[PDB]
Amino acid sequence: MKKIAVLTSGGDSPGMNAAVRAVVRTAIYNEIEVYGVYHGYQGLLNDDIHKLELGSVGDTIQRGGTFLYSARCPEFKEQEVRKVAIENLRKRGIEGLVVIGGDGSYRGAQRISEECKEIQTIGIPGTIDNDINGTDFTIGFDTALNTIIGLVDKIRDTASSHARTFIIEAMGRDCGDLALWAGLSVGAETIVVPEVKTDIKEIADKIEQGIKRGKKHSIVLVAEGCMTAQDCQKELSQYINVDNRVSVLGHVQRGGSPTGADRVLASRLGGYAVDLLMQGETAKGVGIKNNKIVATSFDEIFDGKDHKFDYSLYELANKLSI
Amino acid sequence: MKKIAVLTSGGDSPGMNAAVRAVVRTAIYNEIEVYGVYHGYQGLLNDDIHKLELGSVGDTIQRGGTFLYSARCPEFKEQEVRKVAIENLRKRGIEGLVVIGGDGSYRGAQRISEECKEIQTIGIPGTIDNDINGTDFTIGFDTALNTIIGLVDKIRDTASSHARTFIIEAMGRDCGDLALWAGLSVGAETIVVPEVKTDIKEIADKIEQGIKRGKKHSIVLVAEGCMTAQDCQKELSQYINVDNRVSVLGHVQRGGSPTGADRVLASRLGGYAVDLLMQGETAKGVGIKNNKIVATSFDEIFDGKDHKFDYSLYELANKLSI
Ligand SMILES: Nc1ncnc2c1ncn2[C@@H]1O[C@H](COP(=O)(O)OP(=O)(O)O)[C@@H](O)[C@H]1O
Ligand SMILES: Nc1ncnc2c1ncn2[C@@H]1O[C@H](COP(=O)(O)OP(=O)(O)O)[C@@H](O)[C@H]1O
């Protein structure tokens, strides 16, 4: 394991920079040369590959986004195209590739490893969504959670004293975790997520009761994976009079400096990735499961869903809002 | 389990309010009457005990500190004095007591349960220190971590461009966790903690080398449990010329709104406390261990130290700083 490359792929997630830093510094500590691939898999195809030194990652742990950049590279689904990426790595003597991103990014990594036995690949779970098999938390989830709290606070702090209902749309893709943790965190009356069947009539009856008791500044928090905040508002207005602030929090949830949870998680997983490469491992995603740092094969990562939405935490939220 | 009391004891920790809220709302959901004890165990002795309603805990999840208040009540170490506290609860028909605080607070709770079979007691681990057996994280640790990051950022953002070394004193009592996570989080050159033997000469040789390479704004982060920032500075100056900003972060580390990690942890553990009371349990502290919500007997909590300082995370920090 003499040369490693590292790349960031998919949407930004706070802590990507910290993960790159840990890969680069850990590599060099172990006398491994490390190359940064810029613009995700696009850079891999364009040969936008450059040697990194200790100082290339200075002043990065606190930075949001990714100093390598990212792209969407849909042509990487094609085998012929991946051949060029594999040649750009191999001509450089690269023996290991670390990919930081979500589930889609991992698929690129699996293909590489299948199509070139000479390159070991390791995935690091850089996404806000919390939706990667075999890690309990992804790098960025904790940051995104606090970002949502802060955004909610500003919406309410800047609103009319008389606004009764804030319908706020959270990210998460197909996973309701962000909406659930954020909802509980801000004291939401209602949480709308793809894992629970949404009962509009119940939700509006709750709004209306509280509006009847003079309750102001109530919040419905909505995972984008279930519906948009505007559709929620439109659907509620089929029972009750309501539209008081539809808010789409949007891509800012991906921005901003990672929290300490994310910095530390990123750091542990970036170093572990390099350890695994040195140990001969391949085709695994790294994570934290039951408070242990672990590696799971991409096959198992993609074989199912690998554990439930926490319905009991959903229930606790609803109990606390009563 | 018809009546519960709840109190906060020891230093403030972000998320105490969220824990009280979860106890109160969960109790009432289950048709249990819940009484707030004000000023910790002092209120217990003064009979500063009042019925809470659903609304008594409104607008509290985001609030730092504790709306019940806290005290230090050293006389509670005396059995005769505890008799008065027990009588104030029993005369009210209180059947369960939830104590939120650190290890010292738990001791009060154990005694109560030993001295009055009619009151069940449950501890909730409200402290920044991270130093309670059988939970991996205490309520406030995550908040304190981010508070430290923010404080470090402001020290550096407001300093002379030419300051070379910031010696910053972190809380933690006898546990180095806060200093370790914060250190890694801010990219500290050095981390001084009670679990690792401090090598001053090594530390100064590292400062001096980097100062020689033109490195500015370096940080030594110091757990109060190992030494003060000023003693560290004095000890370093026995090898090298240095004193560039001694900073004692101080009690503010206990203040401020809990992070989402803390709000959610607090909430889960407050509800669990009430569940346990309803189930007949007593003399247990609740926690999160290996990502599972668990209850551990006070005897086991006080029997040892129950798991290591993470030397491997300490090592990773040092590797990343090189
Ligand atoms: N099935 C796949 N096979 C190969 N490459 C893929 C696959 N899915 C995604 N990728 C690569 O990963 C990039 C990012 O994936 P995407 O699904 O947008 O993000 P995420 O990593 O967050 O799931 C895509 O643009 C593409 O280059
Ligand atoms: N051994 C003990 N027996 C009975 N009460 C105790 C004991 N230790 C502490 N307490 C009670 O808990 C209060 C807070 O404890 P302290 O040690 O200050 O905080 P923490 O709960 O953070 O450890 C003390 O003022 C006292 O009332």
From Swiss-Prot, chains A, B:
Name the job this protein performs.
Catalyzes the phosphorylation of D-fructose 6-phosphate to fructose 1,6-bisphosphate by ATP, the first committing step of glycolysis.
**Record's PANTHER family?**
ATP-DEPENDENT 6-PHOSPHOFRUCTOKINASE (PTHR13697:SF4), PHOSPHOFRUCTOKINASE (PTHR13697)
| Family indicated by similarity | Belongs to the phosphofructokinase type A (PFKA) family. ATP-dependent PFK group I subfamily. Prokaryotic clade 'B1' sub-subfamily.
Q: Which residues form the active site?
A: 129 (proton acceptor)
Q: Which residues bind ADP?
A: 21-25, 156, 187-189, 213, 215-217
Oligomeric state and interaction partners are given as:
Homotetramer. Homodimer, inactive form. Component of a possible RNA degradosome complex composed of cshA, eno, pfkA, pnp, rnjA, rnjB, rnpA and rny. Interacts specifically with RNA helicase CshA.
Provide the GO biological process annotations: canonical glycolysis; fructose 1,6-bisphosphate metabolic process; fructose 6-phosphate metabolic process
Its annotated pathway? Carbohydrate degradation; glycolysis; D-glyceraldehyde 3-phosphate and glycerone phosphate from D-glucose: step 3/4
In the Enzyme Commission scheme, what number(s) does this protein have?
2.7.1.11
Name listed for the protein in its UniProt record: ATP-dependent 6-phosphofructokinase
What domain of life does the UniProt record list for this protein's source?
Bacteria
Which keywords does the record carry?
Allosteric enzyme, ATP-binding, Cytoplasm, Glycolysis, Kinase, Magnesium, Metal-binding, Nucleotide-binding, Transferase
* Catalytic reaction list: beta-D-fructose 6-phosphate + ATP = beta-D-fructose 1,6-bisphosphate + ADP + H(+)
Q: A Gene Ontology molecular-function term?
A: fructose-6-phosphate binding
Can you name a GO cellular component term?
A: 6-phosphofructokinase complex
Please name the Pfam families in this protein's record.
PFK
Entries under InterPro entries matching the protein: ATP_PFK, ATP_PFK_prok-type, PFKA_ATP_prok, Phosphofructokinase_CS, Phosphofructokinase_dom, PKF_sf
* Cofactors (names): Mg(2+)
Which residues are substrate-binding? 127-129, 164, 171-173, 224, 245, 251-254
EC class of this enzyme? transferase
Q: What is the effect of changing residue 245 to A?
A: Complete loss of fructose 6-phosphate binding
Q: Where in the cell is it found?
A: Cytoplasm
Protein activity control = Exists as both a dimer and a tetramer and the equilibrium between the active tetramer and inactive dimer is regulated by several allosteric effectors, including protein concentration, pH, ADP, ATP, AMP-PNP, and F6P. ADP, ATP, low pH, and AMP-PNP shift the equilibrium toward the dimer.
Can you tell me which residues bind ATP? Answer: 11, 72-73, 102-105
Sequence positions that bind Mg(2+) = 103
Q: What is its main location?
A: cytoplasm
